[PDB]
A paper describes a structure:
We were particularly struck by one variant, Tae1C110S, which is modified at a partially buried residue sitting directly behind the catalytic Cys30 site. The [name] substitution was the top-scoring GOF variant in the D-Met screen and ranked 11th amongst GOF variants in the M9 screen. Using the E. coli lysis assay, we first confirmed that Tae1C110S indeed lysed cells at a faster rate than Tae1WT in cells grown in both D-Met and M9 minimal media. We did not observe any major structural rearrangements that would immediately implicate distinct modes of Tai1PA-binding (RMSD = 0.746). However, we did observe some key side chain alterations near the Tae1C110S active site, which is the enzyme region most intimately engaged with Tai1PA upon binding. Most notably, we found that His91 protruded away from the active site of Tae1C110S, which would sterically clash with a loop of Tai1PA that typically inserts into the catalytic cleft. Our structural observations are consistent with the hypothesis that the Cys110 position is important for Tai1 recognition; therefore, serine at this position in [name] may be disfavored to preserve immunity to the toxin. We measured Tai1-binding affinity (Kd) for recombinant Tae1WT and Tae1C110S proteins by isothermal titration calorimetry and found that Tae1WT bound Tai1 with ~36-fold greater affinity than Tae1C110S (9.5 nM Kd and 349.6 nM Kd, respectively). Indeed, for PAC110S we observed substantially reduced growth compared to PAWT on solid media but not in liquid media, where T6S is not induced. This phenotype strongly suggests that Tae1C110S lyses kin cells at a faster rate than Tai1 can bind and inhibit killing, leading to a fitness cost for this strain.
Members of the bacterial T6SS amidase effector (Tae) superfamily of toxins are delivered between competing bacteria to degrade cell wall peptidoglycan. We focused on [name] (previously known as [name]) from the common soil bacterium [name], which is known to interact with a wide range of microbes, including E. coli. The taes encode hydrolase enzymes that induce recipient cell lysis by breaking down the major structural component of bacterial cell envelopes, PG. Furthermore, [name] injected into nearby kin cells is deactivated through binding by a cognate immunity protein, T6S amidase immunity protein 1 (Tai1), preventing lysis.
Residue numbers in the entry:
A (entry chain A): 5 to 149
B (entry chain B): 4 to 149
The structure:
Amino acid sequence: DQCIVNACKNSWDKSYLAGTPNKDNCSGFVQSVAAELGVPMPRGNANAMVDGLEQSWTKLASGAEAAQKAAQGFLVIAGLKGRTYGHVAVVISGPLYRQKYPMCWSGSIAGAVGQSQGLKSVGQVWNRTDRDRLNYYVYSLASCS
Amino acid sequence: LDQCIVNACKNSWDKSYLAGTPNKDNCSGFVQSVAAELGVPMPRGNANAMVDGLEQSWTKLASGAEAAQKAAQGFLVIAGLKGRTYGHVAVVISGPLYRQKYPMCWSGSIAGAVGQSQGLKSVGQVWNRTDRDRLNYYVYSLASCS
């Protein structure tokens, strides 16, 4: 998964949207990760992205499987629609927080409380309710060799 | 004539298509919220991505003059131009052209007032004098108003 962690580190410093650092934009951060890895990604805000992922990407059964696919070099997106705004993040390999939630990178307009540079799990980026409703989507071709 | 489109623009000015990002400060999000209000499917993404999608699936008008009269007939018309780093999109509205060339528009912009229009600037005043003559005008297949 080093190729995905590298794309995450590089995306953290780019601005998918004009004038908008990806660290402050959860949908744009994922778009730049996918663009660096050559993976087609559904476009728009987080809700629109999750709709698009649900339609065309493989949905995994668990956060444990999300971590395993990431460990096998696949781009894995954690996503959850919201009543007003959804959220997406990139899952990376690593031990599951609370033996359930995989590690991730995420941008966020909300600031550091919604951001992760690989040291928080999705269970620490999403609230104690939303984290068990998350969906994990995987792209069908490995990116890292 | 284009009142339903001008109303959508006014309503979208105060919305936030992207979390935490007012549409007046986000040219791509401003256009998404206008289209959503009108019920019009719109290519998504940043401005460059939107222009890509418009270029592939919307009818391209021949002139800014043609854009204003299609807007006057109630069609959603998007002015768009790709950039080397970032592109730009805006909603064309009816009204007399600026310098007999550039239709009036609404536009959000992260650049602030320079790139913004609430209907009193033409596309020739939000884009610089270089780009304003290279803009494309994309019209939807169905009229949204009446």
